Amino acid sequence: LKLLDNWDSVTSTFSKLREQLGPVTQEFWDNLEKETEGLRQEMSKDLEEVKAKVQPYLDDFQKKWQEEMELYRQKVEPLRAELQEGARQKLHELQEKLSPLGEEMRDRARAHVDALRTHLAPYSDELRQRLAARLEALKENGGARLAEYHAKATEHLSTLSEKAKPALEDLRQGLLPVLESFKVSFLSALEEYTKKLN
Amino acid sequence: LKLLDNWDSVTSTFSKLREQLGPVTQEFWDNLEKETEGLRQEMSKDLEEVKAKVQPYLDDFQKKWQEEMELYRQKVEPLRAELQEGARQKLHELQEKLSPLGEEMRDRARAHVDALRTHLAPYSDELRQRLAARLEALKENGGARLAEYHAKATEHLSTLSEKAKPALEDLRQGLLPVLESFKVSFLSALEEYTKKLN
Numbered sequence: 474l475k476l477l478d479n480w481d482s483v484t485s486t487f488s489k490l491r492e493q494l495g496p497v498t499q500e501f502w503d504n505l506e507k508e509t510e511g512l513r514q515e516m517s518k519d520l521e522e523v524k525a526k527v528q529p530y531l532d533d534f535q536k537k538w539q540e541e542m543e544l545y546r547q548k549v550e551p552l553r554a555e556l557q558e559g560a561r562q563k564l565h566e567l568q569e570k571l572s573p574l575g576e577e578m579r580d581r582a583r584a585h586v587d588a589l590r591t592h593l594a595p596y597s598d599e600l601r602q603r604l605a606a607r608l609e610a611l612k613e614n615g616g617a618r619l620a621e622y623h624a625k626a627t628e629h630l631s632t633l634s635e636k637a638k639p640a641l642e643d644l645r646q647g648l649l650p651v652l653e654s655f656k657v658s659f660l661s662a663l664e665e666y667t668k669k670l671n
Numbered sequence: 672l673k674l675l676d677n678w679d680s681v682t683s684t685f686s687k688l689r690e691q692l693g694p695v696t697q698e699f700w701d702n703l704e705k706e707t708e709g710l711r712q713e714m715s716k717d718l719e720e721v722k723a724k725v726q727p728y729l730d731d732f733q734k735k736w737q738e739e740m741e742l743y744r745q746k747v748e749p750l751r752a753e754l755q756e757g758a759r760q761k762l763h764e765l766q767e768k769l770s771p772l773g774e775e776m777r778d779r780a781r782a783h784v785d786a787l788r789t790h791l792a793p794y795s796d797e798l799r800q801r802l803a804a805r806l807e808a809l810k811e812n813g814g815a816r817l818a819e820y821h822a823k824a825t826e827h828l829s830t831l832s833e834k835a836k837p838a839l840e841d842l843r844q845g846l847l848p849v850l851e852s853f854k855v856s857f858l859s860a861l862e863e864y865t866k867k868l869n
């Protein structure tokens with residue numbers, strides 16, 4: 474309601490801002506004119522300075538690039554050749570190493586896997602009997618536990634009857650007057666709050 | 672009142688739970704004993720068979736492992752020799768490359784750096800002139816910037832004071848009845864808060 478009075482001061486604030494938006498911004502533009510003029514005194518020389526330097530720079534760089542490229546060509550080629558022969562020697566080494574070791578590894582695998590074929594096979598079979606006996610134990614006690622659980626579930630359901638019936642009715646018998654009392658407190662609160670929030 | 676009866680049902684449940692857990696832990700343990708006894712008997716054969724068989728298992732594996740290690744060491748010697756002799760050539764030939772190609776690198780680096788010296792020296796010197804021009808403009812423009820900024824700041828301070836006092840006093844003057852009316856509503860609303868929760 475009184476916001477009009479407060480906002481009126483905001484309008485005055487806008488006016489004060491507009492006063493600055495004029496000469497201050499205009500002055501800023503005048504400063505910008507100095508900035509642009511300055512840049513036209515800096516960049517004018519800078520750009521030419523760059524051009525007059527980039528040319529010999531790229532030229533000197535080209536010289537260095539040439540030195541590097543030529544030097545690298547006279548290095549990469551012979552080195553690659555030597556590395557190739559060295560790699561071929563390494564390859565031959567690898568071949569002459571991985572071949573006997575490969576055959577050996579295959580026999581190693583034979584001696585290991587065939588061993589496993591005669592180690593894990595009876596092991597799994599033994600485990601099968603062991604697991605079977607264990608399964609029977611789990612089924613014996615499990616089947617009993619199922620009966621026990623069913624009995625306990627029955628006891629639990631029976632002990633739940635005294636909760637889902639009398640206790641639930643008791644809760645309902647409590648909820649009725651409670652909700653009523655809550656309603657009285659809520660209704661009054663609603664009116665009371667509305668009266669002060671109007 | 673509600674909590675008293677509700678919690679009563681809780682204790683009337685904990686008791687039943689305790690009366691249930693009693694035989695439950697026993698029945699569970701009885702079944703657990705049957706299982707664990709069987710597991711023990713089973714584990715007796717399990718561990719014994721595993722240990723009795725682990726002996727020839729390890730013996731078989733170690734036997735082959737001996738061959739694996741022996742043949743490995745047997746071949747490791749000539750293989751290491753191939754690596755050593757081969758590397759001797761590879762490294763020696765490379766050392767014979769790092770020498771001339773290294774000298775060439777240094778010689779190329781000489782021209783590389785020396786050409787850089789004859790370029791970077793005047794480049795940085797001329798850059799000093801460029802930077803001088805930049806700094807000159809930055810100083811001259813800066814002097815204006817600061818002068819204008821001071822002017823703009825003064826203009827800002829003028830409108831600032833026109834708001835820090837008149838507008839602020841308007842706000843503060845309004846804050847008086849506003850805060851008071853708010854206090855009136857808050858203090859009165861506080862009645863409901865207490866008369867509804869106690």
Ligand SMILES: CCCCCCCC/C=C\CCCCCCCC(=O)OC[C@H](COP(=O)(O)OCC[N+](C)(C)C)OC(=O)CCCCCCC/C=C\CCCCCCCC
Nearest residue numbers: 483486487488489490491493494826827828830831834835
């Ligand atoms: C319609 C347009 C109208 C114009 C209205 C503009 C609205 C903003 C209005 C008022 C707030 C300004 C108050 C700031 C006063 C400080 C000025 C100052 O002196 O400042 C520089 C100093 C640091 O200098 P120092 O190292 O020498 O001092 C530290 C000392 N030690 C190193 C030396 C030992 O810093 C400090 O005081 C730190 C101050 C903390 C900054 C508070 C700013 C609060 C305002 C807005 C929040 C902005 C969030 C940003 C969102 C992005 C928007 C684009």
Ligand SMILES: CCCCCCCC/C=C\CCCCCCCC(=O)OC[C@H](COP(=O)(O)OCC[N+](C)(C)C)OC(=O)CCCCCCC/C=C\CCCCCCCC
Nearest residue numbers: 516519520521522523524525526527528529530531532534
């Ligand atoms: C001698 C002179 C010296 C230099 C002086 C300054 C001059 C100004 C120029 C460059 C420097 C400013 C850089 C600011 C970024 C620019 C963004 C921008 O303006 O972009 C747009 C451009 C153009 O695209 P277009 O389609 O319009 O033009 C079509 C192509 N037309 C032009 C070629 C024919 O886009 C591009 O140039 C594409 C680039 C996007 C790159 C993507 C991949 C980034 C990967 C890795 C970076 C991280 C490295 C980190 C590792 C180091 C850790 C220490």
Ligand SMILES: CCCCCCCC/C=C\CCCCCCCC(=O)OC[C@H](COP(=O)(O)OCC[N+](C)(C)C)OC(=O)CCCCCCC/C=C\CCCCCCCC
Nearest residue numbers: 556557558559560561562563564565566567568570571572
């Ligand atoms: C010392 C001097 C020499 C140094 C060597 C020069 C280094 C540079 C050379 C090669 C770079 C290799 C790295 C690339 C990585 C990606 C591998 C990849 O893409 O992997 C996934 C594929 C998927 O299968 P696919 O059916 O789609 O591909 C069929 C392959 N296709 C189409 C080619 C027939 O799998 C494959 O390519 C299967 C890969 C299995 C490779 C088996 C042969 C291994 C040979 C020798 C053993 C060496 C022992 C010595 C080690 C010592 C080193 C110091």
Ligand SMILES: CCCCCCCC/C=C\CCCCCCCC(=O)OC[C@H](COP(=O)(O)OCC[N+](C)(C)C)OC(=O)CCCCCCC/C=C\CCCCCCCC
Nearest residue numbers: 618619620621622623624625626627628629630631632633
């Ligand atoms: C101690 C006495 C208790 C014995 C049972 C009596 C009532 C169960 C009471 C309490 C259990 C605790 C809460 C379990 C949560 C289930 C809520 C429900 O209602 O979930 C229905 C939705 C249906 O969704 P759907 O149609 O897409 O899936 C159909 C399923 N299909 C694709 C997967 C195979 O399923 C789901 O959320 C996923 C779960 C579906 C599980 C169904 C297993 C029913 C097993 C036995 C019922 C027969 C009891 C009779 C035995 C004689 C007793 C004297």
Ligand SMILES: CCCCCCCC/C=C\CCCCCCCC(=O)OC[C@H](COP(=O)(O)OCC[N+](C)(C)C)OC(=O)CCCCCCC/C=C\CCCCCCCC
Nearest residue numbers: 629630632633636681682684685686687688689690691692
């Ligand atoms: C029909 C509806 C029935 C619902 C289903 C049954 C759920 C079981 C529910 C309730 C149990 C019976 C109620 C007994 C009530 C009182 C228990 C008690 O006296 O409470 C207090 C204790 C100790 O007080 P505090 O240390 O907390 O306080 C620190 C002390 N102060 C506060 C001074 C700083 O609290 C403790 O002992 C906290 C327990 C310790 C954490 C045990 C973690 C168990 C994990 C998994 C369960 C599976 C076990 C089987 C797996 C075994 C494999 C070998």
Ligand SMILES: CCCCCCCC/C=C\CCCCCCCC(=O)OC[C@H](COP(=O)(O)OCC[N+](C)(C)C)OC(=O)CCCCCCC/C=C\CCCCCCCC
Nearest residue numbers: 595596597599600601603714716717718719720721722724
């Ligand atoms: C007939 C049928 C045959 C089957 C029979 C075999 C089944 C039983 C299985 C295994 C044999 C159990 C061994 C007997 C019990 C003793 C357990 C124990 O205590 O033995 C002691 C070891 C050593 O102790 P230490 O190393 O400290 O001492 C070494 C420190 N020295 C350097 C300082 C001196 O302890 C250990 O072996 C404990 C290591 C286990 C915990 C590893 C932690 C893994 C953590 C993270 C993995 C990431 C999961 C994330 C998801 C990724 C999935 C891919």
Ligand SMILES: CCCCCCCC/C=C\CCCCCCCC(=O)OC[C@H](COP(=O)(O)OCC[N+](C)(C)C)OC(=O)CCCCCCC/C=C\CCCCCCCC
Nearest residue numbers: 534537538540541542544776777779780781782783784787
């Ligand atoms: C314009 C172009 C001109 C062309 C002309 C060429 C001639 C110039 C010649 C050589 C300059 C290349 C220098 C390479 C970088 C050396 C880094 C370094 O100082 O290294 C040795 C140090 C000493 O060890 P420290 O533990 O005592 O020192 C660390 C402990 N503190 C800090 C406490 C003292 O650190 C180590 O050895 C630790 C290992 C980490 C360093 C790995 C070396 C990485 C090399 C190059 C990176 C760039 C690859 C890209 C280039 C490829 C282009 C195709």
Ligand SMILES: CCCCCCCC/C=C\CCCCCCCC(=O)OC[C@H](COP(=O)(O)OCC[N+](C)(C)C)OC(=O)CCCCCCC/C=C\CCCCCCCC
Nearest residue numbers: 530531533534535537538783784785786787788790791792
């Ligand atoms: C588009 C792509 C192409 C662009 C081309 C750009 C053209 C520029 C071309 C070539 C570079 C010329 C300019 C740089 C050469 C100046 C060398 C110099 O005179 O350096 C002086 C320094 C300081 O003197 P000090 O040795 O007594 O103090 C060291 C004291 N302490 C240990 C505490 C760190 O010496 C040191 O740092 C040396 C001792 C410490 C070792 C540092 C590692 C050096 C190796 C590799 C890293 C390279 C850094 C060079 C990057 C330059 C960027 C401009």
Ligand SMILES: CCCCCCCC/C=C\CCCCCCCC(=O)OC[C@H](COP(=O)(O)OCC[N+](C)(C)C)OC(=O)CCCCCCC/C=C\CCCCCCCC
Nearest residue numbers: 658659661662663666860861862863864865866867868869
């Ligand atoms: C029947 C229906 C049932 C109703 C029941 C439910 C209601 C919830 C109940 C209670 C919650 C509030 C209780 C806490 C009372 C303390 C309030 C207070 O005075 O707390 C101030 C503290 C800050 O410490 P200090 O001032 O004492 O120490 C100053 C430093 N020394 C120590 C050197 C002096 O606060 C802090 O730590 C944290 C907050 C910091 C805030 C500072 C003020 C910022 C101002 C404006 C920004 C906007 C705030 C608006 C929030 C949005 C709301 C939607």
Ligand SMILES: CCCCCCCC/C=C\CCCCCCCC(=O)OC[C@H](COP(=O)(O)OC[C@H](N)C(=O)O)OC(=O)CCCCCCC/C=C\CCCCCCCC
Nearest residue numbers: 541542543544545546547548549550551552553556772776
């Ligand atoms: C973290 C490390 C990252 C580096 C990883 C390197 C390993 C690479 C893996 C395998 C070898 C690959 C070897 C590849 C050699 C081929 C180099 C070449 O000519 O590449 C052509 C490309 C072409 O790019 P374009 O953008 O023109 O084309 C793409 C096209 N539009 C599209 O949509 O697909 O340009 C490029 O990719 C970029 C320019 C490269 C210039 C060459 C520059 C080479 C410079 C120097 C030589 C190398 C150093 C040797 C040192 C030994 C001597 C002392």
Ligand SMILES: CCCCCCCC/C=C\CCCCCCCC(=O)OC[C@H](COP(=O)(O)OC[C@H](N)C(=O)O)OC(=O)CCCCCCC/C=C\CCCCCCCC
Nearest residue numbers: 476479835838839840841842843844845846847849850853
């Ligand atoms: C209608 C009338 C309006 C006029 C009202 C006038 C009332 C003025 C009264 C009080 C204003 C208080 C103005 C305080 C200004 C700064 C005051 C200041 O420097 O305080 C110093 C403290 C000290 O910090 P330290 O870290 O040094 O130590 C902590 C200290 N020991 C402790 O226990 O707290 O730091 C603090 O606690 C600072 C937290 C300040 C909280 C504000 C934090 C900023 C909160 C909000 C601003 C965000 C605005 C977002 C708007 C954008 C979208 C619209």
